[PDB]
Amino acid sequence: MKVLALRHSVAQVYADTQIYTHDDTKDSYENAFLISNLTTHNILYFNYSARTLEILNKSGIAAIEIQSLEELFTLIRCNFTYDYENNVVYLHDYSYYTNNEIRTDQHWITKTNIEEYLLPGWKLTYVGYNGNDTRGHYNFSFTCQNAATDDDIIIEYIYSEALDFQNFMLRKIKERMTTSLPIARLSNRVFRDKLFPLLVKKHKRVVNVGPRNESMFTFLNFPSIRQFSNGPYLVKNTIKLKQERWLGKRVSQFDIGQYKNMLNVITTIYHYYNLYQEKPIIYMVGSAPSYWIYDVRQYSDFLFETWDPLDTPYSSIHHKELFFAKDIGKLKDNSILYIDIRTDRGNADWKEWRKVVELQTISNLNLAYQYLATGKSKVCCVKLTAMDLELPVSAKLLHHPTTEIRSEFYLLLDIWDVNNIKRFIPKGALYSFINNVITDNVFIQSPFKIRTSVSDYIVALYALSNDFNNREDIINLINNQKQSLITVRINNTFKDEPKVGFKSIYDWTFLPTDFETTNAIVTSYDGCLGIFGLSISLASKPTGNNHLFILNGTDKYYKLDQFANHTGISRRSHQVRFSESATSYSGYIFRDLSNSNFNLIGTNVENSVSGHVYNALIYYRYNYSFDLKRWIYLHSVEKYYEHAPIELIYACKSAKEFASLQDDLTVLRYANEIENYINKVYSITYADDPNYFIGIKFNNIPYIYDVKVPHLTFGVLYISDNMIPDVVKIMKSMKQELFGMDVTTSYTYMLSDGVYVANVSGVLATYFKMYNLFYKNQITFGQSRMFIPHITLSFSNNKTVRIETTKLRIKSIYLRKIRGDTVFDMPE
Amino acid sequence: MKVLALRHSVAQVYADTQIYTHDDTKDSYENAFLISNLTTHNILYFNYSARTLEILNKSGIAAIEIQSLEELFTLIRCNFTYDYENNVVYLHDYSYYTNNEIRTDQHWITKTNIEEYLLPGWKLTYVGYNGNDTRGHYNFSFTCQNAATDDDIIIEYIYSEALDFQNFMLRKIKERMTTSLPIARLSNRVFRDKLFPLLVKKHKRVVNVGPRNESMFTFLNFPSIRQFSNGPYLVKNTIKLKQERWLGKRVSQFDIGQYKNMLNVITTIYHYYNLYQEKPIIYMVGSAPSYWIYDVRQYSDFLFETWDPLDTPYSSIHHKELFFAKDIGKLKDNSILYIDIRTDRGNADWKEWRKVVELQTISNLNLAYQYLATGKSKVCCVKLTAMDLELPVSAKLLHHPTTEIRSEFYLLLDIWDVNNIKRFIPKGALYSFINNVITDNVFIQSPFKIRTSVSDYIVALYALSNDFNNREDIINLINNQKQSLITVRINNTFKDEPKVGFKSIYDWTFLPTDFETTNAIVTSYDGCLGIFGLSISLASKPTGNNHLFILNGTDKYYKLDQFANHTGISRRSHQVRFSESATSYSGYIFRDLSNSNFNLIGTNVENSVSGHVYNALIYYRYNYSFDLKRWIYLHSVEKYYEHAPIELIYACKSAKEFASLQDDLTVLRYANEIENYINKVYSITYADDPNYFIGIKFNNIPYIYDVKVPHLTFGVLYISDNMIPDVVKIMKSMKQELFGMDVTTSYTYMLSDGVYVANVSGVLATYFKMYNLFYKNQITFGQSRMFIPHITLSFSNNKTVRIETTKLRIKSIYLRKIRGDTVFDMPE
Amino acid sequence: MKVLALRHSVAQVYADTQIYTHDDTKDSYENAFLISNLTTHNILYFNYSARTLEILNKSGIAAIEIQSLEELFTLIRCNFTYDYENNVVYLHDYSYYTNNEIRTDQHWITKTNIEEYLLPGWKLTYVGYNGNDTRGHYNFSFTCQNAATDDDIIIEYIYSEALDFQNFMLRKIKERMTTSLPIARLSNRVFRDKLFPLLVKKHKRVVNVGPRNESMFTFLNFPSIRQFSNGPYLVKNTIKLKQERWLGKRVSQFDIGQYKNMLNVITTIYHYYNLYQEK
Numbered sequence A, B: 001m002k003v004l005a006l007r008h009s010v011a012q013v014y015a016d017t018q019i020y021t022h023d024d025t026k027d028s029y030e031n032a033f034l035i036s037n038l039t040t041h042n043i044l045y046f047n048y049s050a051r052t053l054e055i056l057n058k059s060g061i062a063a064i065e066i067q068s069l070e071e072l073f074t075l076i077r078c079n080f081t082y083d084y085e086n087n088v089v090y091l092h093d094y095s096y097y098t099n100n101e102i103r104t105d106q107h108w109i110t111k112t113n114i115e116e117y118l119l120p121g122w123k124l125t126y127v128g129y130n131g132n133d134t135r136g137h138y139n140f141s142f143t144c145q146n147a148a149t150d151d152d153i154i155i156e157y158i159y160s161e162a163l164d165f166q167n168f169m170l171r172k173i174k175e176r177m178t179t180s181l182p183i184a185r186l187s188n189r190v191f192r193d194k195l196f197p198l199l200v201k202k203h204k205r206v207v208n209v210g211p212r213n214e215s216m217f218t219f220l221n222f223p224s225i226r227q228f229s230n231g232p233y234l235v236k237n238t239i240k241l242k243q244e245r246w247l248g249k250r251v252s253q254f255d256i257g258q259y260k261n262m263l264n265v266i267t268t269i270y271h272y273y274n275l276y277q278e279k280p281i282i283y284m285v286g287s288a289p290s291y292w293i294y295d296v297r298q299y300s301d302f303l304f305e306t307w308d309p310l311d312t313p314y315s316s317i318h319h320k321e322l323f324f325a326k327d328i329g330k331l332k333d334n335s336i337l338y339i340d341i342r343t344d345r346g347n348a349d350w351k352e353w354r355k356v357v358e359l360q361t362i363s364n365l366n367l368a369y370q371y372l373a374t375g376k377s378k379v380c381c382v383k384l385t386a387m388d389l390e391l392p393v394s395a396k397l398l399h400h401p402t403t404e405i406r407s408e409f410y411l412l413l414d415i416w417d418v419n420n421i422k423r424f425i426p427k428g429a430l431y432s433f434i435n436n437v438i439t440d441n442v443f444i445q446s447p448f449k450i451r452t453s454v455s456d457y458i459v460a461l462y463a464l465s466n467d468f469n470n471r472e473d474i475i476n477l478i479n480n481q482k483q484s485l486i487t488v489r490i491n492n493t494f495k496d497e498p499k500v501g502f503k504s505i506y507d508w509t510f511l512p513t514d515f516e517t518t519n520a521i522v523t524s525y526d527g528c529l530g531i532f533g534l535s536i537s538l539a540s541k542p543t544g545n546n547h548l549f550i551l552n553g554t555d556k557y558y559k560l561d562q563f564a565n566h567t568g569i570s571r572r573s574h575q576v577r578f579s580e581s582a583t584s585y586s587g588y589i590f591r592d593l594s595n596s597n598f599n600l601i602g603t604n605v606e607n608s609v610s611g612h613v614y615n616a617l618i619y620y621r622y623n624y625s626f627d628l629k630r631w632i633y634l635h636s637v638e639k640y641y642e643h644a645p646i647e648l649i650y651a652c653k654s655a656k657e658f659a660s661l662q663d664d665l666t667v668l669r670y671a672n673e674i675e676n677y678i679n680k681v682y683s684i685t686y687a688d689d690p691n692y693f694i695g696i697k698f699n700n701i702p703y704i705y706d707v708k709v710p711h712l713t714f715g716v717l718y719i720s721d722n723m724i725p726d727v728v729k730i731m732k733s734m735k736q737e738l739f740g741m742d743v744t745t746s747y748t749y750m751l752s753d754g755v756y757v758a759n760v761s762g763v764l765a766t767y768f769k770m771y772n773l774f775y776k777n778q779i780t781f782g783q784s785r786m787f788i789p790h791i792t793l794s795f796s797n798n799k800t801v802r803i804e805t806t807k808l809r810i811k812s813i814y815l816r817k818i819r820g821d822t823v824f825d826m827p828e
Numbered sequence C: 001m002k003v004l005a006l007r008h009s010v011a012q013v014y015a016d017t018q019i020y021t022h023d024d025t026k027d028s029y030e031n032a033f034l035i036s037n038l039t040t041h042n043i044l045y046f047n048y049s050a051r052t053l054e055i056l057n058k059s060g061i062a063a064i065e066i067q068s069l070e071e072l073f074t075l076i077r078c079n080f081t082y083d084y085e086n087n088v089v090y091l092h093d094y095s096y097y098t099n100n101e102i103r104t105d106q107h108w109i110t111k112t113n114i115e116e117y118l119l120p121g122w123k124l125t126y127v128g129y130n131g132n133d134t135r136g137h138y139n140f141s142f143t144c145q146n147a148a149t150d151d152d153i154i155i156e157y158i159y160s161e162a163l164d165f166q167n168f169m170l171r172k173i174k175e176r177m178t179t180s181l182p183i184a185r186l187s188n189r190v191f192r193d194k195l196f197p198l199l200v201k202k203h204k205r206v207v208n209v210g211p212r213n214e215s216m217f218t219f220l221n222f223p224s225i226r227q228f229s230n231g232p233y234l235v236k237n238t239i240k241l242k243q244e245r246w247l248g249k250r251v252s253q254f255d256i257g258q259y260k261n262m263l264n265v266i267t268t269i270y271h272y273y274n275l276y277q278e279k
């Protein structure tokens, strides 16, 4: 939506493409509301106050100050993510292709030969995390940087099994200049970066579920988190594999040895974090060039100590040019040891040189056992060729990709992988692992058992919703659990399909109303950006991979008009009402017809009902950022605004009817889901065949009438005959809000056959309040019909006569017994 | 789109929902273009000239003057159709439901009992054609009236076989306040009203194909038109029907006798128009109340002469209260006779009263034959019960609906239906016609044989495209034919589906490129509104029942920038470029990558190619109002603007690539459809391995270089050695447009391996003209590659160096022989 | 699958359309197994023992004895349901249309004017439950009767809001001679008839869920069952309804007063059974 707030005396409207203008000083949050229901994508907000920007930025709507026009305004056009507490703009613009470069955020790729393999004239540069080395280009009122990088192209290529690179990047560079910017994907690395370091301090613990190599680096300075994912591959499960022979396969023009050397270490550490919430010393041998070190130090600071003949530019201590051979007792315990002692064949005979590779492998294991023989908290990660070896069963294999597959895989070990566990593995049982099994993830820790906990702050962002997880176990994990941040997918389709996918995998799909939480928000992506200190410039789409977010047990459940609020509620309706092929009164006509006020749709300008909810139900696909359920519970019990209980049912009933004609079975369910939850948090009682009624007499009715005493039957009630004395309290306590309300009549109509009446206006708000004061005093009041206030005139069938809006005022009020000869109260 | 032009000194921007503002005086044509590529639906145009409104209104964009704010501006919000030559606004607002009425445009329904059968409190009123009796409510700078009526509800109900009316209207009134305004359907009755009376005078003849009861009244003052439709039902085809017995069926609460009495006459007339191109006297008997007369006189003026005992309010001469019995020679020939001599049973015994009904029927036929025995040009339409009768084979039966089916059907006769043609029909062969066959259409004239004609101005608006018509015959009717106005459906879907429908019937679907017309427009609905004097406020949707319109042989083929012009061309692109999830340079990057200028996408701000067409190809679903084909043929031969031939191929080639990734096989076809039509109206030749070239030398190159003589190879050509003397004309005739063009260089790049070059800018427009000048002199010039102008510097591989934009100027120009030692021309 | 067991010395293979033959004495249940994995729909089983037929009939495979060829074999071609303990064949053949009749199992429709409203020449007759008045036509080694009736056409027409009957039946009679015999639907009324009376005497208390007017008559001699279904419409829920006026609507050429007079009583009873397990 991208609100751009411009200087009062310096501000221009030009022939732009998606620009509305807004300017007012009515009330701060009412202004932000009126903005947030505006249609277009780019809005100029000419005279402003900081609090109107606060509310929007809190609502996930990116709203920012603009002080100048030449570059501060033209470059903040493009889409972005805004941290509204440190005033940093994370742009997501792929217009940097124009000066003919790609850009990464990993230093190691710069030292490859890759620029030989890019298209002619292109380069890569500006290597910083989130583009934090971009900010040197711009000089604004705010800090700014373009976090768009092409990590996708390079990393997918490695996992792509394709060999021509120019063909590859030319394909993908054309995909972005064709298809939609995936913002929900780029804003997450921003979100993840600030999401954990505050969460860890606030709760003192955290568990994450399903981390992928999106987060290879997020957690390197967080030992005290415990991540769970797909389990590892074990030596225990090589016995499955069919035998196979050397397969010389090349899948990368440019050498990516530094990438696996980075991953195998990183895997080794998250393992060490899994066992001992700790963080180690990191010894190394055989790995000099190590341009992947500087990538690591941008996140967490580790002590790297290396033994290699060649240059290690990035380390604390490069101890020797000798490679660590048997001086092994000189190591500290709190450690990991990464062994990559190797060789390179020259032109020597492969059949005889193979003998050398076998002997190193025997040695490299002897180093591993002697390491793990003495001290506790020691983790190894050792180099192996594919030959017959005696390996521990419970150990974990790794084959992160490389330049080319030529018979080697790495093994990592723990202290208990030595304690009397050993198996013999044949040769071709390893090649069968090498050649077909690519390791996918450095996070090889055990799966998350789906059950509630009370010490755990559980995060689960894109791990659950998979079809293979028990639906009810995740539901109960969400309902019967405090302390979390869970994400699940919304049922964004019609005909209520419970499982939705890509023709590869299906995922479980939810509505908001699957969950009877106790104190929790259930909002969208943009809403939770606001909760955690962020705001985004692009709105969510009605279809696509939208996801419910669920915050349990948080400080912000009571702060309703701040976070996950009624912002954005009517944005799509206004499009339908005025523009997209309908009359402006379409919603004002339908809901009265569907609630049996179909004779009268004149007074549907004002005094209609079913405001917030009817929009929340039929356009949930757009505005599920508004947690409807949280809105209702906090008005059951006053913890601004107030509507009657009755109005919410009519909002539900009309959405059913609407979804019936449309045949949108998902709204139709969602309407059923709500209305019996409305009848849950509070009951509703109906004096269907009442005994008493509240009546209002007037001085003079400016119409023709044959009924001997015209009156307004203001409401009916069914009570016991000694709760009159506490009904009259309310007759008394609001006597002037009835004498003081603008009763007006302007016309006659036909309420029904043989019942010719007037219309009364301007009274309902008092009628809705009265309903609530009788309510909490446990007094029945009102019928299941819609109370349309009317003054009876005659039992005939006549013509609607219009007069000027003539004010009527109250003779008296009275509480009358139906078919009785006496009353007991009448204010005056 | 609804352009609203506001007063200069009286004009307000407020917190509205779909408002851009535009204001400029750069150009009249160029301003309307910039408007027409604006996104939103409602545009305020603050300072204006009449010609900018003319162009838009001519482009189908409704653009109107606004002089005041209170009601002239607030009520012109809603959608409408505008006749920009008489300044009449036809609104299409269904907000008249609020004062609780429906509205018709047929006087006869007001005299029914229907208001007993409407929902309680509702009425019907304001009965005028197109709402021409609405204009008394509004006092504006323009004439105005709300042509929205509820004829749908009433007429469908009659053809609906449902009996409860309150249930019916409540259903349909809720359909409109739910679903999209069918603006295209509503604007046609406006279109049809002014479409024919001018067309008839201009060509002196006209044939229409597939008229429905949308047009019961359009043609009543047009004898000289010859309509064709589904043939009639004949007595000849009762021999099929199984025997059946009396079926007492009631399908209308309210009496609709006046409706069939209206239809049977109207059928009788269009028949008489079919036989003789003249228009009759219209005698009647048995039909007094005849409140349907006033409906007829609002369109065409006929002489009605009636014989009935009861009151005929609306007629010329109600001759007698006796009903026309045997004084039959006293009738004029040029006539139709409508017989409805009948009775009404009281409480008499149905078994004996039936004998009376039989005798009238014998009499009513004797009247019919005695009528058609004497004079020529006489038609009848007679009342019959279902009994065994001796009927002419070739006669035509009618059972337009009624209140209730109780055994009667009407028969119409022509002069040749008496000349020795008679058959015996059994009783139940008529009930089987009555009870199951509802007549659908008063237009019972023979079908249109699908073949070309040269005297015929053929209209065909929504009759063709049906799956049962031979596709090629309608194609050839469109291609091999002048003098017409044909409509066909567009292939608005993807994966190139040739036939599309509603799961009831399928219809043939076209692209614009199915047709090699000679002088014809192929545009949208809104474009042809402009051509005929109309403009509409709502844009067409990318999917839905869009239809190509085809105007053959019209005066407006050469007037390109007026009608069916490049208006609206980039509206959807601007949405994609800036807002809907992409960088603004996305289109500027893709088309260079897809045309092998992928090394360089820096100079894609300006000097890119493929402007109009690439947008016409991938977003044809939005902007098929622009006839791409007409645009190209009129630039092949100059009959403002000019682009080279080369640019159009690259526009086509890139749309293919675009549609390949997307897998939109319809653009992919449409690209193939165009490019070989580009190679049709004009050839393109390529000096792929040339002999000569045009070279340009400069004073000094502000770069490093190792080539001994840096030069711009401005273009290459393959010619004979004695067409040098007419090549040199062109260099001489444009020597200063080369000396006078802003040659500039700003950087170096890699054109290819071992070719390090500079970039030249600002020259291409002269290069494109030069290609055109050589072209028509039949000289080869240019290669199939894209000519990216470059100055060679060195045969190495180096780094892009940026400098300030430094102007370079021309030493000389020269025409050089490739690997030769001499030249023969050099300007200076 | 329709196993037809033929006499040893009297048995013929002819040029038939879906016939395998099987004959062996290996082992009783191994033989039935080998049969039950045979492809075709009609199987001749030439020399047999009763226990091989028992197993199949217990397996849901209809397997029956055939003693003669002229009519006991040619008419047991068509599809059927077999009660293998009382040896009754419930045929499901709609070939009775050929002698130009429909057939019901409710006596009241015969006293209407409906034969004025059938297609010319047709009639209705043979009104018995499950066609239990059909068995007078056939003289077989087993009891037999054609339980195919056209209750669908008549009852749907009443619930159809359509008024022309000849048009109606001609439509539906053509649906059956077009589409597949719904056997899983016709065999249930057989199933329901014997399913409950034995359950009742075996289990002291029973309850049924979602009965429809398939079973208007199944339960009339079972008070001690407690059926549950969609709740009633109450006077309590008229307050919803919009006001409306007399609507004269005719949806049945022939008078069906006897049908509602039957239903209103029957409703009244199952109610009385619901309150007081009584009759």
Ligand SMILES: Nc1nc2c(ncn2[C@@H]2O[C@H](COP(=O)(O)O)[C@@H](O)[C@H]2O)c(=O)[nH]1
Pocket: A037, A570, A574, A611, A641, A643
């Ligand atoms: N009673 C009530 N009315 C509201 C509330 N919010 C908006 N409205 C009404 O709904 C209108 C919405 O205007 P719109 O967004 O359709 O232009 C407001 O102008 C106001 O009349 C609310 O919270 N409570």
Ligand SMILES: Nc1nc2c(ncn2[C@@H]2O[C@H](COP(=O)(O)O)[C@@H](O)[C@H]2O)c(=O)[nH]1
Pocket: B037, B570, B574, B611, B641, B643
């Ligand atoms: N050569 C040429 N360029 C055009 C033509 N029409 C528009 N353009 C270019 O395309 C641009 C379109 O701007 P946009 O509508 O994308 O903001 C114009 O500003 C102009 O540079 C045309 O007819 N010929």
